[PDB]
DNA sequence: TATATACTAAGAAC
DNA sequence: CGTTTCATTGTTGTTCTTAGTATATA
């Protein structure tokens, strides 16, 4: 969808006396559950997609304010970019004392009408000016029949909800919890896009993740040309990036204001001010000095116009894993520049896959960049698990190292092992099996940095101090393999360390 | 390591004439020595260069005599290379009219080495003589000369106009003498130490490769909690960047110290200037607002680690990881710390087991404290000289990205017709850069890209030359040998006209 | 004890 | 004829630079 557009999620909780103090047992509370869900998802969205929009608005309350001054509707925080000033507002309600505050500030929960609730949350989406990529509404209620008493209210409810379904807005409820009354065919089968007393769909909204994402962002579009005449349009995209911590901003010590760094360069002999034209680049070779233009120090790189230079093809066994150089990239046609080039792209991909052969190219990502040698190794698509995209179809960009990279190894001799040790190592390596999944692990540094960020943003009673799968679970290795370390010691270990 | 360089050129008469179709040995070897001095100029290696332009119309050498050590002009003694020496060589040399022996110059350079290579610390010595073998030489001291070369640790090489695979009987018997001398130095392999002048151009044309020594990092390869193994990590491939940066210097004065890149921090209000390095505290963006984090709280709340922590998290199938996902900056090589053989054999057991069972290891990695940890593939490698294991960064989950990328097999709007398909077959078979050779399935990889110098550094050194050898002059274009180097070998381009021609009639190519 | 050689880790530039 | 609203072109994230600290080596 339109990239500049942004995701928008509005939060809407049943504020009636129904679930404010349901608390059948003393281990949970639906309001203490819904607010927990909202806080968790909203803090996750802080780090994840800080560019997006969230809003929380309660219905059925007794105090009133909204855009249209209606009855029993409270817009707690409007639609805006997420921030701590609202983390605190939500946190103010978390607690039995907090629920006391909520009830004596907005109300026990009066009469309501989800028609007017849909009417008003629609107004919230309408209000804000930034374009919206996706628009989702989350209800939080368990009164599976909003009203079996006034059918006219319910008819107007279907009408307005169907309208929202056709104004571009989706709607969603997770059935939180109710003694009985845990069904969706009662008035909601026609609303949302078998059933039980609790929603799995709300459990994952507690998964409490700190990832971040960027949309289908073309890193650079370059025109792959087969020769000097045939040219096709390729979008160099990125599929692994090594996220770094967000770059810090320098702030004034009491005033916490931005400080607008103003680095400059000027003379030492005089109190003048050197201008960018007024400086020269230099090196020192052979006990003699060198001068070039600041313009020339970048002209020393002009090698080829931007694009891709296919020369020939290679067998996929000759392209070796042993000589990785840079994060790989992905190749996919972009129909916009050269119309119809997608056909030729597909032809090359299919036929190369058929003959199990690589494609070699010269890659000049932008101007003023020396070219490297890159392999267009085709990739087949796989969808088998649930018919959802896993490996996008197209070409890799396996960068091929230049000679100056080999880093000649300090040769040492080899000593073969005896087949007895390798035979027992067979069992050793078998025992420590574990299936590896691409998203198995997290950066302890990035995760902990984000965590400390929330900790300071809120002063929540301790920092989270997340423990992460990066550290090995030592007892597991000592146990599930046994004491075979001593076996290999008595096999191939003399007394010295 | 250290090395001593003493080049020896002749300035006699015979090299002043040659076949009109090929440049004379004088100018040929002259370009050769010029660009060789270029090599050891750009490379910052501590090699010290001396020059002996024997066969001189005069005699300017420390060992001057009436007939002993005659007709030699030592250009300059064994010190560092520098530009003005190169320029003088390019200019001061003159065509000669005499003929002189080269054993003379060989012993003279021998004496120079014995007189200087001990006065300053050295490790290995090299003597190189360029000539055309048109000299009158006696075999008197050859035994003693080779003896001293063995004792003084000097390697002798000769470079001659003819090719091993039309010269005078003088030159022919000189060539036989040269073979005798080289074999009298090293052995039968002395044949390879014979060199022509065209092949010298071919083997020398490129600028000096930027050799780069790695660091012996030893680490404790940890598996479980009771099978620690000393492991020596080494880097294999690294995106190489130039060593010393482009120093910024002021025009018309050309001093570095006359410029200060001082940074000043101001406030947005009335352009108030903040005190440079104590009033600023670093913040971070958390949604709308900025959290006053700091540096002290950074070092206090930062994640910590035990240290090296190269500990194996587990083992997995080869296909369980893939080429695409390799997320490294650099690719390590994982070898045993030397002198502990039992460790080496244990590691060999590890590697071979992983190989035959196509299993791959996943190890937590960290170069040291205060550095971000790291998890990735530990791939094992086999070479007849030695087994190998390599480590590469593999992504953390936040680093992985996901995209839809609407598929292609839905090509009801693109429709790769069979004519186009068999066309592309003709292409990918015809432009096949690699084709099987020697019945060993070593395909036509006359584009390895693994032996090819990085053209960036080539252009950088060429620029530094062309604007060093000259005062202010406009820059030159890319030297055609660089382009021929970068372009594919010609035969592939030749085979490609017809298939691309049949392409151009089978697809749309809108603007 | 001095020197540089290595590294990572910053930065800002574009 | 004047006022209001909407849509689009400039927008940037990334790479490279320098820094800084790191250590062992000679």
Strand order of the β-sheet with B280-286 is A249-252, B280-286, B289-291
Beta bridge partners of B377: B362, B392
* Partner residue facing A229 (CB), from B286, B460, B504: B504
* Phi, psi angles (nearest 5°) of residue A267: -80, 155
Query: Residue B33's closest CA among B15, B14, B49?
Result: B49
Q: Are B365 and B375 in contact (CB under 8 A)?
A: yes
Separation of alpha carbons A101 and A76, rounded Å: 14
Which residues of chain B does A400 touch, with a Cβ-Cβ cutoff of 8 Å?
449-450
Residue in chain B nearest A321 by alpha carbon: B323
- Chain B nearest-CA distance from A7, in A, is 15
Helix ranges restricted to H, B18-82? 25-42
Architecture of the domain spanning B418-509:
Orthogonal Bundle (1.10)
Query: Residue A329's closest CA among A389, A375, A383?
Result: A375
Could you please report the per-residue DSSP string of B260-277? E----EE-SSTTPEEPTT
Residue nearest to nucleotide C9 (CA to C1'): B371
Q: Which residue has the tokens 């960036």?
A: B456
Going by C-beta distance under 8 Å and a sequence separation of 6 or more, which residues neighbour residue A305?
A: A364, A367
* Partner residue facing B453 (CB), from A391, A396, A402: A402
Q: Are A214 and A222 in contact (CB under 8 A)?
A: no
Whole-number distance in Å between A2 CA and D19 C1': 40
A436 and B321 within 8 Å at the Cβ level: the answer is yes
Query: Residue B11's closest CA among B132, B172, B112?
Result: B132
DSSP H or E stretch at residue B295: none
Q: Are A404 and A396 in contact (CB under 8 A)?
A: no
Residue B119 DSSP label: T
B291 and A449 within 8 Å at the Cβ level: the answer is no
Going by C-beta distance under 8 Å and a sequence separation of 6 or more, which residues neighbour residue B53?
A: B8, B9, B10, B11, B72, B73, B75, B93
Which letter, b or e, does each residue of B473-491 get, where b requires 16 or more Cβ atoms within 10 Å of its Cβ? eeeeebeeebeeebebeee
- Chain A nearest-CA distance from B2, in A, is 17
Which residues of chain B does A300 touch, with a Cβ-Cβ cutoff of 8 Å?
459-460, 463, 475
Query: Residue A195's closest CA among A203, A184, A207, A206?
Result: A184
- Chain B nearest-CA distance from A216, in A, is 6
Strands A231-238 and B229-238: unpaired
Count CB pairs under 8 A between chains A and B.
Answer: 539
Separation of alpha carbons A395 and B172, rounded Å: 59
Which letter, b or e, does each residue of A27-60 get, where b requires 16 or more Cβ atoms within 10 Å of its Cβ? eebbbbbbbbbbbebbbbbbbbbbebbbbbbbbb
**How many angstroms is the resolution?**
8.4
Which residues of chain A does B257 touch, with a Cβ-Cβ cutoff of 8 Å?
268
Q: Which residue has the tokens 């022996």?
A: B101
Separation of alpha carbons B398 and A450, rounded Å: 12
Which residues of chain B does A272 touch, with a Cβ-Cβ cutoff of 8 Å?
none
Q: Are B388 and B347 in contact (CB under 8 A)?
A: no
Residue nearest to nucleotide D13 (CA to C1'): A219
Q: Are B207 and B462 in contact (CB under 8 A)?
A: yes
A264 and B259 within 8 Å at the Cβ level: the answer is no
Structure tokens given for A64: 């009133």
Which SS3 state, helix, strand or coil, does residue B491 take? helix
B399: left (phi over 0), alpha (psi -120 to 50) or beta: alpha
Fold annotation for B3-207: Rossmann fold (3.40.50)
Which letter, b or e, does each residue of B367-395 get, where b requires 16 or more Cβ atoms within 10 Å of its Cβ? eeeeebbbbbbbbbbeeeebbbbbbbbbb
Whole-number distance in Å between B115 CA and C12 C1': 53
* Residue A262 annotated to the active site: no
B237 and A325 within 8 Å at the Cβ level: the answer is yes
What string of H, E and C letters represents the secondary structure of B364-384? EECCCCCCCCEEEEEEEEEEC
Long-range CB pairs of A153-159, under 8 A, 24+ apart, other chains included: A153/A113, A153/A115, A154/A187, A156/A113, A156/A115, A157/A113, A157/A114, A157/A115, A157/A118, A157/A187, A158/A190, A158/A191, A159/A115
Beta bridge partners of A80: A54
Separation of alpha carbons A124 and B131, rounded Å: 91
Q: Which residue has the tokens 């490379």?
A: B43
What string of H, E and C letters represents the secondary structure of B396-426? CHHHECCCCCCCCCCCCCCCCCHHHHHHHHH
Task: Write out residues whose CB is closer than 7 A to strand D.
Answer: A 4, 214, 219, 238, 241; B 121, 216, 239, 241, 245-246, 248
Q: Which residue has the tokens 């110059």?
A: B105
Q: Are A21 and A15 in contact (CB under 8 A)?
A: no
Q: Are B77 and B51 in contact (CB under 8 A)?
A: no
Could you please report the per-residue DSSP string of A373-396? EEE--EE--B-TTTT--SB-SEEE
Experimental method: cryo-EM
Residue in chain B nearest A235 by alpha carbon: B405
Which residues of chain B does A262 touch, with a Cβ-Cβ cutoff of 8 Å?
263-266
Q: How many residues does chain A have?
A: 497
* Partner residue facing B83 (CB), from A286, A322, A452: A286
- The catalytically annotated residue of A2, A406, A408, A473 is A2
- Does the beta carbon of A398 lie under 8 angstroms from any beta carbon of chain B? yes
Residue in chain B nearest A247 by alpha carbon: B284
- Chain A nearest-CA distance from B168, in A, is 41
Query: Residue B100's closest CA among B141, B145, B68?
Result: B68
| Distance (Å) of CA B302 to CA A473, B107, B366 | 22, 66, 16
Q: Would the CATH topology of B3-207 be identical to that of B418-509?
A: no
Structure tokens given for A165: 């379904």
Separation of alpha carbons B205 and B207, rounded Å: 7
Q: Roughly what angle, to the nearest 10 degrees, separates helices A30-48 and A84-91? A: 170
- Nucleotide with minimal C1' distance from the CA of B245 is D17
| Distance (Å) of CA A409 to CA A404, B44, B124, B235, B381 | 13, 21, 21, 8, 14
Task: Return the number of other C-beta atoms located less than 10 Å from residue A202's C-beta.
Answer: 20
* Phi, psi angles (nearest 5°) of residue B96: -105, 175
Residues 88-107 of A with CB under 8 A from B: none
Going by C-beta distance under 8 Å and a sequence separation of 6 or more, which residues neighbour residue B274?
A: A252, A259, B265, B266, B267, B280
- Nucleotide with minimal C1' distance from the CA of B372 is C8
- Chain B nearest-CA distance from A385, in A, is 15
Which residues of chain B does A314 touch, with a Cβ-Cβ cutoff of 8 Å?
433-434, 443, 445
| Distance (Å) of CA A48 to CA A9, A135, A218 | 14, 17, 20
Q: Are B145 and B110 in contact (CB under 8 A)?
A: yes
B416 and A350 within 8 Å at the Cβ level: the answer is yes
Strands A170-173 and A132-140: parallel
Residue nearest to nucleotide D12 (CA to C1'): A219
A265 and B312 within 8 Å at the Cβ level: the answer is no
Query: Residue B448's closest CA among A401, A263, A231, A135?
Result: A401
Largest CA distance in chain A: 97
Q: Are A93 and A101 in contact (CB under 8 A)?
A: yes
E-strand spans in B103-257?
A: 124-130, 154-159, 194-195, 217-221, 229-238, 247-250
Long-range CB pairs of B501-507, under 8 A, 24+ apart, other chains included: B502/B423, B502/B426, B503/A226, B503/A230, B503/A344, B503/B423, B503/B427, B504/A229, B504/A230, B506/B419, B506/B420, B506/B423, B507/A230, B507/A340, B507/A343, B507/A344, B507/B420
Whole-number distance in Å between B123 CA and D25 C1': 16
Separation of alpha carbons B319 and B358, rounded Å: 9
A429 and B281 within 8 Å at the Cβ level: the answer is no
- Does the beta carbon of A465 lie under 8 angstroms from any beta carbon of chain B? no
Which residues of chain B does A466 touch, with a Cβ-Cβ cutoff of 8 Å?
none
Separation of alpha carbons B211 and B43, rounded Å: 9
- Chain A nearest-CA distance from B42, in A, is 7
- Does the beta carbon of A441 lie under 8 angstroms from any beta carbon of chain B? yes
Task: Write out residues whose CB is closer than 7 A to strand C.
Answer: A 247-248, 261, 263; B 213-215, 235, 263, 282, 330, 367, 370-372
């Amino acid at each position: 969808y339109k990239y500049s557009g942004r995701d928008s999620l509005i939060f809407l909780v049943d504020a009636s006396k129904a679930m404010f103090e349901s608390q059948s047992e003393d281990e949970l509370t639906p309001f203490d559950m819904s607010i927990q869900c909202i806080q968790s998802v909203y803090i996750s969205k802080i780090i994840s997609s800080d560019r997006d929009l969230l809003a929380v608005v309660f219905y059925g309350t007794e105090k009133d304010k909204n855009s249209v001054n209606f009855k029993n509707i409270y817009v707690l925080q409007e639609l805006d970019n997420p921030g701590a000033k609202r983390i605190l507002e939500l946190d103010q309600f978390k607690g039995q004392q907090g629920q006391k505050r909520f009830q004596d500030m907005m109300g026990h929960g009066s009469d309501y009408s989800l028609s007017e609730v849909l009417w008003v949350c629609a107004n919230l989406f309408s209000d804000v000016q930034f374009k919206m990529s996706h628009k989702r509404i989350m209800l939080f209620t368990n009164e599976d029949n909003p009203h079996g008493n006034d059918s006219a209210k319910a008819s107007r409810a279907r009408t307005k909800a169907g309208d929202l379904r056709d104004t571009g807005i989706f709607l969603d409820l997770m059935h939180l919890k109710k003694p009985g009354g845990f069904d969706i065919s009662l008035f909601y089968r026609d609303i949302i896009s078998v059933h039980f007393e609790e929603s799995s769909k709300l459990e994952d909204l507690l998964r409490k993740v700190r990832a971040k994402e960027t949309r289908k962002r073309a890193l650079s579009r370059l025109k792959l040309k087969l020769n000097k005449d045939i040219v096709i349009s390729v979008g160099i995209y990125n599929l692994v990036q090594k996220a770094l911590k967000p770059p810090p901003i320098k702030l004034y010590r009491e005033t916490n204001e931005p400080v607008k760094t103003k680095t400059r360069t000027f003379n030492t002999s005089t109190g003048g001010l050197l201008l960018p034209s007024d400086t020269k680049r230099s090196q020192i070779y052979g006990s003699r000095q060198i001068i070039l233009e600041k313009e020339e120090t970048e002209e020393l790189k002009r090698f080829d116009d931007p694009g891709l230079m296919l020369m020939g093809f290679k067998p996929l066994v000759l392209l070796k894993k042993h000589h990785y150089l840079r994060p790989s990239l992905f190749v996919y046609p972009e129909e916009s520049l050269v119309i119809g080039s997608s056909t030729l792209f597909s032809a090359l991909l299919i036929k190369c896959l058929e003959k199990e052969v690589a494609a070699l190219c010269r890659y000049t990502p932008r101007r003023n960049i020396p070219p490297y040698f890159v392999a267009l190794v085709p990739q087949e698509e796989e969808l088998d698990d649930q018919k959802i995209q896993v490996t996008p179809p197209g070409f890799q960009l396996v960068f091929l190292p230049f000679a100056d990279d080999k880093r000649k190894m300090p040769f040492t001799e080899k000593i073969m092992a005896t087949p007895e040790q390798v035979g027992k190592m067979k069992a050793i390596v078998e025992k420590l099996r574990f299936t590896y999944r691409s998203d198995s692990f997290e950066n302890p540094v990035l995760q902990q940095h984000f965590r400390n960020l929330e900790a300071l943003a809120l002063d929540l009673m301790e920092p989270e101090q997340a423990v992460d799968l990066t550290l090995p679970k030592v007892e597991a290795m000592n146990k599930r393999l046994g004491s075979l370390v001593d076996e290999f010691k008595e096999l191939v270990y003399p007394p010295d360390y | 390591n250290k090395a001593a360089v003493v080049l020896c050129m002749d300035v006699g008469f015979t090299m002043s004439n040659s076949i009109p179709g090929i440049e004379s040995p004088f100018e040929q070897a002259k370009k050769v020595i010029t660009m060789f001095v270029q090599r050891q100029v750009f490379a910052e290696n501590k090699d010290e260069i001396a020059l002996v332009l024997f066969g001189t119309d005069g005699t300017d050498n420390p060992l001057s005599g009436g007939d002993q050590y005659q007709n030699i002009t030592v250009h300059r003694h064994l010190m560092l290379p520098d530009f003005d020496l190169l320029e003088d060589i390019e200019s001061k040399i003159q065509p000669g009219s005499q003929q002189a022996d080269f054993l003379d110059a060989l012993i003279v350079s021998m004496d120079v080495i014995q007189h200087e290579t001990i006065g300053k610390k050295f490790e290995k010595r090299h003597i190189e003589i360029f000539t055309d073998l048109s000299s009158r030489f006696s075999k008197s001291q050859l035994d003693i000369i080779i003896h001293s070369l063995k004792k003084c640790d000097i390697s002798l090489q000769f470079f001659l106009p003819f090719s091993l695979g039309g010269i005078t009987e003088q030159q022919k018997e000189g060539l036989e003498i040269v073979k005798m001398v080289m074999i009298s130095l090293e052995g039968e392999d002395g044949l390879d130490e014979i060199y022509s002048f065209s092949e010298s151009l071919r083997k020398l044309c490129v600028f000096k490769k930027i050799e780069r020594h790695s660091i012996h990092w030893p680490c404790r390869l940890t598996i479980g909690s009771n099978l620690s193994i000393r492991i020596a990590a080494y880097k294999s491939i690294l995106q190489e960047r130039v060593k010393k940066t482009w120093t910024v210097v002021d025009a018309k004065t050309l001093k570095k110290e006359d410029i200060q890149k001082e940074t000043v921090y101001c406030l947005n209000d009335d352009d108030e200037t903040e005190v440079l390095k104590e009033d600023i505290i670093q913040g971070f963006r958390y949604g709308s607002d900025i959290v006053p984090f700091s540096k002290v709280d950074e070092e206090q709340m930062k994640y910590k680690s035990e240290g090296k922590c190269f500990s194996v998290l587990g083992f997995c199938k080869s296909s369980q990881v893939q080429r695409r996902f390799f997320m490294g900056n650099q690719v390590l090589k994982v070898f045993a710390a030397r002198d502990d053989e039992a460790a080496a054999v244990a590691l060999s057991s590890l590697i071979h087991a992983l190989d035959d069972l196509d299993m791959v290891a996943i190890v937590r990695y960290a170069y040291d404290k205060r550095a971000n940890p790291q998890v990735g593939v530990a791939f094992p490698h086999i070479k007849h000289n030695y087994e190998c294991l390599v480590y590469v960064q593999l992504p953390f989950m936040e680093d992985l990205r996901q995209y839809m990328f609407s598929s292609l097999k839905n090509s009801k709007k693109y429709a790769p017709t069979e004519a186009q398909l068999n066309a592309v077959d003709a292409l990918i078979d015809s432009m096949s850069l690699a084709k099987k050779d020697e019945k060993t399935d070593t395909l036509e990889d006359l584009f390895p890209t693994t032996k090819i110098p990085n053209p960036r550094f080539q252009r950088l050194f060429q620029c530094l030359l062309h604007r060093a050898l000259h005062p202010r002059e406009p820059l030159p274009p890319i030297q055609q040998h660089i382009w021929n180097m970068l372009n594919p070998p010609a035969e592939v381009t030749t085979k490609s006209q017809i298939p691309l021609s049949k392409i151009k009639t089978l697809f749309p190519l809108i603007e």
